[PDB]
Amino acid sequence: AQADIALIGLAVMGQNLILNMNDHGFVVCAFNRTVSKVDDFLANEAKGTKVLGAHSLEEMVSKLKKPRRIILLVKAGQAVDNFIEKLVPLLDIGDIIIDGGNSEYRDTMRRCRDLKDKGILFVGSGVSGGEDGARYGPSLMPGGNKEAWPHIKAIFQGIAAKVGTGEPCCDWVGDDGAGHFVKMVHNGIEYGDMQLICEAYHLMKDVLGLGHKEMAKAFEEWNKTELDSFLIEITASILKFQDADGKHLLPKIRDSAGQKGTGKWTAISALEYGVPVTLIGEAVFARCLSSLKDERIQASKKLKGPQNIPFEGDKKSFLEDIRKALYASKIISYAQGFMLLRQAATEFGWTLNYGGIALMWRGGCIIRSVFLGKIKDAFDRNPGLQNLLLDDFFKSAVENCQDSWRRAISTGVQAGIPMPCFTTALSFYDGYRHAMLPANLIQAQRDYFGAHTYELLAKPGQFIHTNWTGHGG
Amino acid sequence: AQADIALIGLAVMGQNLILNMNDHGFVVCAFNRTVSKVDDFLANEAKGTKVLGAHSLEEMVSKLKKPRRIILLVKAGQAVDNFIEKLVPLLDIGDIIIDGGNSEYRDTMRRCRDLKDKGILFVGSGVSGGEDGARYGPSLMPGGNKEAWPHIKAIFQGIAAKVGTGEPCCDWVGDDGAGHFVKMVHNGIEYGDMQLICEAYHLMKDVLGLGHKEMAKAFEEWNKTELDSFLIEITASILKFQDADGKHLLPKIRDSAGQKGTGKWTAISALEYGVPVTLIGEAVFARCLSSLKDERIQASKKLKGPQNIPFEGDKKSFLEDIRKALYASKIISYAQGFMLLRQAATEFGWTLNYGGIALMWRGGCIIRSVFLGKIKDAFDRNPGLQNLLLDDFFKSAVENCQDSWRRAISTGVQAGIPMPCFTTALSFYDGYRHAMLPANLIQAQRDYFGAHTYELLAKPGQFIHTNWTGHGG
Ligand SMILES: NC(=O)C1=CN([C@@H]2O[C@H](COP(=O)(O)OP(=O)(O)OC[C@H]3O[C@@H](n4cnc5c(N)ncnc54)[C@H](OP(=O)(O)O)[C@@H]3O)[C@@H](O)[C@H]2O)C=CC1
Numbered sequence: 001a002q003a004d005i006a007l008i009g010l011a012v013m014g015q016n017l018i019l020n021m022n023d024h025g026f027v028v029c030a031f032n033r034t035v036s037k038v039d040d041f042l043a044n045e046a047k048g049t050k051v052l053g054a055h056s057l058e059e060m061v062s063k064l065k066k067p068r069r070i071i072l073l074v075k076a077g078q079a080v081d082n083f084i085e086k087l088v089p090l091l092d093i094g095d096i097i098i099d100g101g102n103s104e105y106r107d108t109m110r111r112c113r114d115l116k117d118k119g120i121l122f123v124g125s126g127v128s129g130g131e132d133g134a135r136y137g138p139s140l141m142p143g144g145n146k147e148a149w150p151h152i153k154a155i156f157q158g159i160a161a162k163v164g165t166g167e168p169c170c171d172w173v174g175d176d177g178a179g180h181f182v183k184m185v186h187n188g189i190e191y192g193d194m195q196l197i198c199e200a201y202h203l204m205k206d207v208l209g210l211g212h213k214e215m216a217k218a219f220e221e222w223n224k225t226e227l228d229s230f231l232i233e234i235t236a237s238i239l240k241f242q243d244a245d246g247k248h249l250l251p252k253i254r255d256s257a258g259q260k261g262t263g264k265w266t267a268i269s270a271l272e273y274g275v276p277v278t279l280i281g282e283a284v285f286a287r288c289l290s291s292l293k294d295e296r297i298q299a300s301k302k303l304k305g306p307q308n309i310p311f312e313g314d315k316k317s318f319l320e321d322i323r324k325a326l327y328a329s330k331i332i333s334y335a336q337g338f339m340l341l342r343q344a345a346t347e348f349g350w351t352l353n354y355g356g357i358a359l360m361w362r363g364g365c366i367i368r369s370v371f372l373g374k375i376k377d378a379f380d381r382n383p384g385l386q387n388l389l390l391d392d393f394f395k396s397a398v399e400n401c402q403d404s405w406r407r408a409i410s411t412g413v414q415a416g417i418p419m420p421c422f423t424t425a426l427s428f429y430d431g432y433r434h435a436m437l438p439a440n441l442i443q444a445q446r447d448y449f450g451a452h453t454y455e456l457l458a459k460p461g462q463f464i465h466t467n468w469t470g471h472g473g
Numbered sequence: 474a475q476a477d478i479a480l481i482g483l484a485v486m487g488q489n490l491i492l493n494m495n496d497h498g499f500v501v502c503a504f505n506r507t508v509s510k511v512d513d514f515l516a517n518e519a520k521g522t523k524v525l526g527a528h529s530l531e532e533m534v535s536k537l538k539k540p541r542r543i544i545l546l547v548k549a550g551q552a553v554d555n556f557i558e559k560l561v562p563l564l565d566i567g568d569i570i571i572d573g574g575n576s577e578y579r580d581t582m583r584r585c586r587d588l589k590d591k592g593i594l595f596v597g598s599g600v601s602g603g604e605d606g607a608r609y610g611p612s613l614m615p616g617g618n619k620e621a622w623p624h625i626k627a628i629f630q631g632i633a634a635k636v637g638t639g640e641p642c643c644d645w646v647g648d649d650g651a652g653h654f655v656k657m658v659h660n661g662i663e664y665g666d667m668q669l670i671c672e673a674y675h676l677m678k679d680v681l682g683l684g685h686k687e688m689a690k691a692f693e694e695w696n697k698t699e700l701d702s703f704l705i706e707i708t709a710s711i712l713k714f715q716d717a718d719g720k721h722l723l724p725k726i727r728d729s730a731g732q733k734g735t736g737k738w739t740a741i742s743a744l745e746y747g748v749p750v751t752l753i754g755e756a757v758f759a760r761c762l763s764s765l766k767d768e769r770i771q772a773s774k775k776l777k778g779p780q781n782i783p784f785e786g787d788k789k790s791f792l793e794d795i796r797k798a799l800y801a802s803k804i805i806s807y808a809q810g811f812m813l814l815r816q817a818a819t820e821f822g823w824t825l826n827y828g829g830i831a832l833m834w835r836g837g838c839i840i841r842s843v844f845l846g847k848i849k850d851a852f853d854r855n856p857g858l859q860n861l862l863l864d865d866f867f868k869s870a871v872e873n874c875q876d877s878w879r880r881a882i883s884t885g886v887q888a889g890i891p892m893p894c895f896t897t898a899l900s901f902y903d904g905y906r907h908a909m910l911p912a913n914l915i916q917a918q919r920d921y922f923g924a925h926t927y928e929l930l931a932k933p934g935q936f937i938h939t940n941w942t943g944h945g946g
């Protein structure tokens with residue numbers, strides 16, 4: 001009794017969350033497996049604060065006020081499990097472990113269940129924002145065992161980022177893996193937004209022949225419109241940045257996009273649970289494509305492009321078309337993301353508050369934007385909205401953009417600019433608007449070669465198998 | 474000693490394979506868990522053949538010539554495992570179990586390994602073709618423990634379908650899950666081909682306003698060109714088919730496409746192992762989209778489409794454009810499929826013979842086509858080809874189609890026809906041809922908000938982190 005909460009894991013993320021925590025008047029006891037790290041932090045970044053250190057897992061446990069509350073901000077995987085094993089013998093029934101690492105929603109569920117019967121309340125939380133966010137106000141997404149929530153509410157919401165009306169970008173997400181499932185869908189969406197920005201970049205660079213200087217200006221103009229977001233803002237900075245030598249740094253960087261795995265999971269989840277989250281799929285795959293750098297070098301030497309027609313038209317107009325095409329496509333993957341969230345909710349029995357989640361992504365996290373605010377009051381006005389595209393704001397915004405959107409894509413297609421995400425968003429949009437789709441032909445084929453049966457348009461329910469093979473032979 | 478091989482599982486697929494087997498002069502002993510089924514078959518379909526029945530798993534084992542060879546054509550999952558458990562006590566070291574069900578490549582690997590140390594040779598085989606194929610010549614894809622192969626080679630290749638020069642559409646695929654991994658990639662590709670056919674159907678139906686009668690004729694014309702395939706052929710039949718009442722049956726069928734899961738796995742595998750198999754992804758997702766039937770009904774009432782511009786142009790030309798767009802897109806997903814096959818080969822240590830696999834899909838299976846022949850001699854001429862698009866035939870075929878292809882997609886886009894697969898194939902094509910892609914901007918963003926480091930275009934290898942945040946603050 002003295003420390004309010006413990007944090008294990010002293011890399012920059014843990015470090016900054018403890019300082020953030022301390023600034024809101026919480027005594028935190030630090031610990032790390034390379035114990036020397038605890039000293040180093042106490043004498044350096046945490047010198048002159050109220051944070052205590054522990055040199056043994058056992059004395060860390062000793063410092064805590066009951067219910068003991070300890071946070072793991074350790075590498076996801078095995079590491080988290082090891083710590084749980086060691087922690088459980090020392091803790092009392094009713095104690096709380098939070099895993100803040102980017103964990104697998106399934107590993108979280110398992111752990112949550114497992115700890116319930118040993119009387120230990122487990123919460124898996126998504127943390128977003130990076131070092132900066134960690135330090136002044138991260139976005140936090142806690143889920144797991146709801147009994148832990150009243151014991152941690154004050155800390156998490158206190159250090160959480162705050163939206164303009166002072167609400168925290170943190171609230172209870174739901175049971176077991178919910179917080180960790182929300183965290184990864186956030187990253188899926190993050191991948192999506194980035195690829196969309198790249199596509200817009202690629203069209204103004206190759207079709208419009210803009211230099212990085214003008215392209216930064218155009219993004220900066222765009223950040224004053226509906227597109228106002230952290231990502232459009234940093235993109236304008238990146239395009240302007242000049243290296244030591246005076247020339248722009250971005251053209252020097254190698255185009256193989258890495259990925260630490262979370263985006264991958266969103267798209268795999270959609271595939272497992274049957275949700276058309278096509279834009280995040282294309283975004284993950286566009287990263288896979290860029291990894292085949294040497295292969296694209298070799299392919300560029302021999303695969304021919306379209307005939308070169310120079311762009312004739314008003315650059316200012318096309319620039320505006322690219323803006324609206326980005327915006328409509330962004331609306332589309334957010335509609336795909338929240339329908340994945342709805343399906344997962346249905347699969348695992350979570351009562352998700354989608355306006356709540358919108359608010360949690362409104363600040364702190366990388367995808368923060370004014371856009372998320374508009375999503376929040378769509379679900380406020382109607383919490384049972386099946387799909388974002390049916391809310392009048394989005395239905396109006398997309399309707400309003402579609403001319404430009406189709407123009408932007410036709411030009412790209414003729415010019416040979418790769419647009420994975422612009423094209424899936426439009427395909428999906430046109431797919432979803434259609435009451436009748438050619439899917440009935442798939443059914444006919446499936447029934448024909450594999451006898452799989454089909455149902456009629458009127459009288460859904462009965463499955464028929466036609467004998468196509470011969471009908472008069 | 475008397476029967477050459479046993480088959481367990483007497484649904485139509487097992488039934489027909491046993492008759493096929495018997496016709497090639499192999500004595501087969503049948504067995505099934507609802508043992509009554511064995512009698513029913515012996516007195517009915519198998520009456521007057523040489524197939525023996527067994528009424529106990531033990532007497533089935535007794536009838537077999539050593540090395541005992543038994544085939545499971547049972548529902549994939551638990552069922553297969555149950556049978557293995559029961560079989561292993563009765564078998565001798567050196568005996569062979571083949572699982573012909575549509576199994577998980579991972580379950581196959583596990584089983585293959587597991588049985589090795591108990592001295593039982595396991596082979597997992599993919600079987601394709603349906604009832605018809607099962608009866609006269611299926612496509613067969615055996616993998617697992619290579620020691621079983623000489624003992625089953627004669628039967629499998631004997632009942633296998635034969636290509637015009639008499640080679641069997643069956644040869645050893647590789648170790649453990651290989652045969653079962655090839656089987657599922659085949660289905661992935663199958664999903665792909667079907668969605669492409671639907672898209673072509675949708676454009677001639679809505680943009681060209683063709684009736685099902687002309688559309689069948691156009692497909693029938695197309696089946697005489699490079700597009701010559703089983704699927705284009707049955708599609709022409711389906712479009713012509715008239716119901717009892719005299720009107721076309723296809724417009725009566727409900728557009729929710731089912732899926733038994735295999736297509737799903739191909740796309741999940743690509744995501745796990747980092748391969749841009751975008752067309753099969755879009756195809757699986759297009760099935761997911763059609764399942765939201767009631768939702769599309771509700772969306773059709775409120776999401777607006779493009780302005781209605783009537784199609785003005787020559788129908789004959791556009792029809793030809795749709796043909797070439799289908800063909801180029803098909804080339805693209807086959808290039809994506811064989812690069813997935815190459816990566817899996819690299820992941821699990823399989824020495825795959827891609828021309829061999831091309832030959833196995835040349836007859837028997839649903840995707841059979843003249844196209845697969847062209848793929849086979851691409852890999853014959855060069856077995857180490859990294860990607861099909863670099864082979865001069867395909868490089869020429871795509872170059873030759875791209876005008877039409879871009880025309881077809883621009884028209885679709887303006888008209889509002891959903892084209893998931895036509896657009897990913899083009900996106901990917903334009904993606905892969907480009908030596909330099911906007912992926913370097915992702916890297917800049919990743920380094921900026923998450924410190925993730927990046928490497929330079931010249932000097933690959935060194936990872937740099939720039940401090941973007943402030944460069945003079
Ligand atoms: N995508 C998004 O929206 C966002 C993602 N995130 C990510 O969350 C991540 C948090 O992890 P990070 O802090 O970088 O840590 P790392 O994954 O680098 O792991 C190092 C830390 O975990 C500990 N650790 C490592 N291995 C073990 C082990 N085997 N056993 C016990 N402890 C272990 C280390 O202790 P020791 O030093 O003793 O080894 C150290 O404290 C960040 O990378 C951040 O980018 C954050 C914000 C946003």
Ligand SMILES: NC(=O)C1=CN([C@@H]2O[C@H](COP(=O)(O)OP(=O)(O)OC[C@H]3O[C@@H](n4cnc5c(N)ncnc54)[C@H](OP(=O)(O)O)[C@@H]3O)[C@@H](O)[C@H]2O)C=CC1
Pocket residue numbers: 450481482483484485486487505506507508510546547548549552553555574575600601602603659660663838839
């Ligand atoms: N996509 C492609 O390219 C192709 C896919 N395939 C597919 O492969 C499939 C083969 O399976 P199919 O023959 O239809 O069989 P089913 O999946 O319908 O299973 C029924 C058969 O398996 C047995 N079985 C069921 N449950 C068990 C159990 N619990 N324990 C033991 N045995 C069990 C049944 O025996 P009992 O009657 O005693 O229950 C019966 O023999 C076909 O559906 C076919 O479409 C084939 C060609 C191509």
